[PDB]
């Protein structure tokens, strides 16, 4: 019925008419030069899609996809390997036309068969959540350059997400299981190719100079550097010192003390290094500490509420962090879907049927993480923590909390990446000790952190909840019970309340008017159950770089736009 060259999850695509290049690029940007970047931890293989292993920097971008997303919109799709698509009004089937000029790096064509092969490969050797999400979906080459996708139930976002699948060359991947790590880079297709590396230490990408899609609208003014090099550092302090010394070119500064007090010295005086701070109005990544609620120590909501009360954010922000941070308080932070007011009538129609299985505060209060006076030793909050612990059966015997029936101490392990700056850890450990709670600290390397995060082999560990601009069907992978082993369910929660709210969200894909009370209602359930302990976020981007680059006039809303930068040989000439 319909045929289009652009798509959007909600509303209309911004570049629907006369699309020559994005607003946030310089179409005339020159090619050449190197950018060197840091990475924290280590890596051991090149397959981002395997069941295990520690994949190298940028290995999620080795392959082009059927459509690609703009960076100044939440979810709009524009042609890459595909030229266009025909589709049913409900998006339950689509026929994708493949660009006949599309090529892998060895010069061979990308065909409809490669896409069909790619879907079956993920279905049979991929991450276990893929065959669950696309249960009943088929992907079939119906012509040499036409792929037909059919969904067994309506899912406009699930359809559009298949446009982001990497398109694998069958001629290489027929000889490699998708679940196995790769010691060597696979045959690929994107604008940059791995050309050298040292296992665990560096990866070098080279610009593909005859890249078949270099002049497509989505690519104009992007992929300008001839070389992108990643050097690995074991902790962020030595990385920050290497940046100041000139060892790499660009730093995203996530430490408040570094920004407030350490952007000093010869290289800043002579303006060799540029420091930039821009406010950011869009959806925000948030930091949390995950409670593993499958372990007895964190199975009681009252214990999780009490440990949250012991986390003195106002003191940390004032005494340690130069008042730089804002407190995390939503799984839809800084969007319309955050539950920052009282439930309206539409939300109550969604929530009231489940009042038996909900904390009563969902209906009567706005969720607010604990606030202290910032002086330290908050009497009100620590008295309330004691009150909740006693009710849950953890009582003081001597100086240590002990189960009132068994007599087993209240004790747990905080699992920590050795690479992180963790100035907040000892203050939190001290506050818990004053409640009689023992928290052991275990710092481990990047490979053990990845292995144990995936298997949930922890009592508590830090987790980042990525920015979610609308209530996406991805939510089921992180929260719904059948996806408990996807590696994205940090607390280990299997709740029929969550499941019903997310099943309604998945049934309303692409329908904003109904996703709005659904998202706010889900936010209330996730926050009021204290599945995780809210830390902090900042709505500004703090960046610094050596002055060898120039940038477009406009920065994209949803990323920093580094792939639109270029090497400026006049500015570079002025550096030592």
């Amino acid at each position: 019925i319909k045929e289009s060259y652009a798509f959007a999850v909600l509303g209309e695509p911004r570049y629907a008419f006369n699309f020559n290049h994005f607003d946030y690029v310089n179409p005339a940007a020159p090619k050449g030069g190197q950018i060197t970047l840091s990475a924290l931890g280590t890596f051991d293989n090149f397959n981002r899609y395997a069941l295990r292993g520690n994949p190298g920097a940028r290995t999620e971008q080795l392959y082009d996809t059927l459509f690609t997303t703009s960076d100044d919109e939440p979810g709009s799709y524009y042609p890459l390997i595909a030229e266009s698509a025909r589709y049913a009004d409900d998006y339950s089937w689509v026929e994708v036309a493949i660009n006949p000029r599309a090529r892998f790096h060895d010069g061979s064509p990308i065909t409809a068969r490669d896409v069909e092969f790619t879907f079956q490969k993920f279905m049979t050797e991929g991450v276990p959540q893929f065959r669950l999400v696309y249960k009943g979906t088929t992907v079939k080459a119906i012509a040499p350059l036409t792929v037909r996708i059919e969904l067994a139930k309506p899912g406009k976002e699930d359809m559009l997400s298949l446009f982001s699948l990497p398109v694998f060359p069958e001629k290489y991947w027929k000889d490699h299981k998708l679940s196995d790590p790769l010691a060597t880079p696979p045959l690929a297709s994107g604008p940059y190719r791995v050309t050298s590396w040292k296992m665990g230490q560096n990866i070098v990408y080279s610009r593909v100079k005859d890249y078949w899609a270099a002049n497509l609208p989505v690519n104009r003014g992007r992929w300008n550097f001839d070389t992108i090099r990643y050097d690995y550092y074991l902790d962020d302090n030595v990385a920050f010192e290497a940046f100041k010394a000139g060892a790499f070119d660009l730093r995203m500064e996530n430490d408040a003390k570094n920004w407030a007090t350490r952007y000093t010295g010869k290289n800043f005086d002579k303006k060799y290094i540029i420091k930039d701070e821009q406010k950011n109005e869009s959806a925000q990544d948030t930091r949390w500490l995950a409670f593993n609620i499958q372990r007895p120590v964190f199975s009681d909501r009252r214990v999780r509420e009490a440990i949250t009360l012991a986390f003195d954010f106002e003191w940390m922000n004032k005494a340690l962090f130069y008042n730089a941070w804002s407190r995390t308080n939503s799984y839809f932070q800084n969007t319309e879907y955050a539950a920052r007011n009282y439930p309206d009538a539409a939300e109550l129609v969604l929530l009231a049927p489940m009042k038996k299985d909900l904390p009563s505060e969902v209906f009567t209060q706005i969720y607010q993480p604990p606030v202290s006076k910032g002086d330290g030793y908050d009497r009100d909050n620590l008295l309330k923590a004691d009150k909740l612990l006693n009710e849950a059966g953890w009582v003081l015997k001597g100086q240590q909390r002990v189960n009132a029936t068994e007599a087993q101490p209240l004790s747990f392990e905080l699992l920590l990446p050795a690479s992180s700056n963790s100035q907040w850890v000892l203050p939190f450990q001290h506050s818990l000790q004053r409640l009689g709670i023992n928290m052991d600290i275990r710092k481990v390397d990047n490979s053990q952190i990845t292995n144990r995060m995936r298997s949930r082999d922890y009592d508590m560990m830090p987790r980042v909840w990525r920015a979610m601009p609308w209530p996406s069907s991805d939510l089921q992978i992180s929260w719904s019970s059948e996806y408990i082993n996807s590696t994205y369910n940090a607390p280990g929660v299997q709740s029929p309340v969550i499941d019903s709210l997310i099943n309604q969200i998945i049934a309303a894909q692409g329908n904003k008017e109904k996703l709005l009370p659904l998202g706010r209602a889900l936010d209330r359930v996730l926050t009021w159950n204290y599945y995780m302990l809210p830390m902090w976020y900042m709505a500004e981007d703090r960046l610094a770089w050596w002055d060898k680059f120039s940038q477009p006039a406009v920065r994209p809303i949803y990323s920093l736009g580094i792939d639109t930068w270029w090497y400026d040989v006049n500015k570079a000439a002025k550096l030592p």
Binding site: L51, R52, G126, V127, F130, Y134, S486, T487
Partner: peptide
């Protein structure tokens, strides 16, 4: 994420 494990 439907195509890869957490990192």
């Amino acid at each position: 994420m439907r195509t890869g494990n957490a990192x």
